[PDB]
Amino acid sequence: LAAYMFLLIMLGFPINFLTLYVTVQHKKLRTPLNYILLNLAVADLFMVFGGFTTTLYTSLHGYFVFGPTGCNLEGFFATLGGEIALWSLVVLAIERYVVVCKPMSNFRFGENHAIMGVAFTWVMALACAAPPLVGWSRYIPEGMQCSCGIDYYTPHEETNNESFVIYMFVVHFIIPLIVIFFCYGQLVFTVKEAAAQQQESATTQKAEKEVTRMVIIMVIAFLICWLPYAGVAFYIFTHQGSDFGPIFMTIPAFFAKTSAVYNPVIYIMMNKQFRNCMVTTLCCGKNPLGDDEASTTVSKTETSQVAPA
Ligand SMILES: *C/C=C(C)/C=C\C=C(C)\C=C\C1=C(C)CCCC1(C)C
């Protein structure tokens, strides 16, 4: 595995470099909709803790085995490293969305709760600590966490798979999905809304028009894995290999390593710097005539202005 980890946690880093500069680039004016590279700093930098250091050093060849921990990009930083993306998109997706999901909540603060859902976030990182760590200490369980082996995992992996496949789900792509939908009914105020994510979505304060590329990606961000894998990930993680689920994994662990590709999910920058703009040159893009080179802070007295752009 060490060099599918370069094919594709290198080239993953550092075009997660020219991605993961960029929410340490300034440390942004973080957070916003680039909390996503503060969430996916602790989740696509930690997906390098991960695909360099320990899951590529000690981490799984390299090492090992080890353990370590959850494997631990896989148990930890792909909870975080995909969980956090499920979240980072129950917000983005559909941060059409946040702001019209919700109630724009104060004129902000349909920030949410996404800032404050960043405190929901470790709410499901103390709550993907809670089962998770007492997932391992449900006990061996601590199978491919500690072992990286067994022997609940398998006699009887159904609780254990059969609860977390069905435990993150249980709710985590149950209501959210059903809640979470609905203002993914701000996805029917979005299906007619790319006339809104176009003009209150090429123009709802922050980074957005291309915001509408919103949902070119964000339901292929749904789909990209998490349609063939909501398929071959639910049914996979009935788990049931020995020797065919894994292996098979990779493929079952490929597209969430081609969803460690925060590249066409930084542009989606977009998102702070595709608005500011309005202007003379170029696109990504915000009306578009030109789109530049305007707004900047406050968010403008001129030339691509003030709810800019
Ligand atoms: C690269 C390896 C990965 C991403 C390993 C595990 C993936 C998950 C625990 C996926 C969680 C999710 C599910 C089941 C459904 C909604 C989307 C999701 C990514 C949060």
UniProtKB/Swiss-Prot annotation:
Pfam families: 7tm_1, Rhodopsin_N
Described purpose of this protein according to its UniProt entry: Photoreceptor required for image-forming vision at low light intensity. Required for photoreceptor cell viability after birth. Light-induced isomerization of 11-cis to all-trans retinal triggers a conformational change that activates signaling via G-proteins. Subsequent receptor phosphorylation mediates displacement of the bound G-protein alpha subunit by the arrestin SAG and terminates signaling.
Quaternary structure annotation from Swiss-Prot or TrEMBL: Homodimer. May form a complex composed of RHO, GRK1 and RCVRN in a Ca(2+)-dependent manner; RCVRN prevents the interaction between GRK1 and RHO. Interacts with GRK1. Interacts (phosphorylated form) with SAG. Interacts with GNAT1. Interacts with GNAT3. SAG and G-proteins compete for a common binding site. Interacts with PRCD; the interaction promotes PRCD stability. Forms a complex with ASAP1 and ARF4. Forms a complex with ASAP1, RAB11A, Rabin8/RAB3IP, ARF4 and RAB11FIP3; the complex regulates Golgi-to-cilia rhodopsin/RHO transport in photoreceptors.
Tissue specificity remark: Expressed in rod-shaped photoreceptor cells in the retina that mediate vision in dim light (at protein level).
Effect ascribed to mutating E74Q: Causes shift to the activated conformation
Chief place where the protein resides: membrane
UniProt name for this protein: Rhodopsin
Consequence of changing T55I: Stabilizes the activated conformation and hinders hydrolysis of the covalent bond that retains all-trans-retinol
Cysteines paired by S-S bonds: C71-C148
Classification via CDD domains: 7tmA_MWS_opsin
Gene that specifies this protein: RHO
Modified residues (N6-(retinylidene)lysine): K257
Location within or outside the cell: Membrane; Cell projection, Cilium, Photoreceptor outer segment
Post-translational modification: Phosphorylated on some or all of the serine and threonine residues present in the C-terminal region. Contains one covalently linked retinal chromophore. Upon light absorption, the covalently bound 11-cis-retinal is converted to all-trans-retinal. After hydrolysis of the Schiff base and release of the covalently bound all-trans-retinal, active rhodopsin is regenerated by binding of a fresh molecule of 11-cis-retinal.
Lipid-carrying residues in chain (S-palmitoyl cysteine): C283, C284
Gene Ontology biological process terms from the UniProt entry: absorption of visible light; cellular response to light stimulus; detection of temperature stimulus involved in thermoception; G protein-coupled opsin signaling pathway; G protein-coupled receptor signaling pathway; gene expression; microtubule cytoskeleton organization; photoreceptor cell maintenance
A GO term from the CC aspect: sperm head plasma membrane
Membrane topology reported for the UniProt record: Multi-pass membrane protein
Gene3D superfamilies reported for this sequence: Rhodopsin 7-helix transmembrane proteins
Extracellular side: 58-71, 135-163, 236-247
Ranges spanned by the short sequence motif 'Ionic lock' involved in activated form stabilization, renumbered to the chain: 95-97
GO molecular function, one term: arrestin family protein binding
Ranges per topology, Cytoplasmic: 23-34, 95-113, 186-213, 270-309
Region (Interaction with SAG): 291-309
Protein source organism: Bos taurus (Bovine)
Coiled coil: none
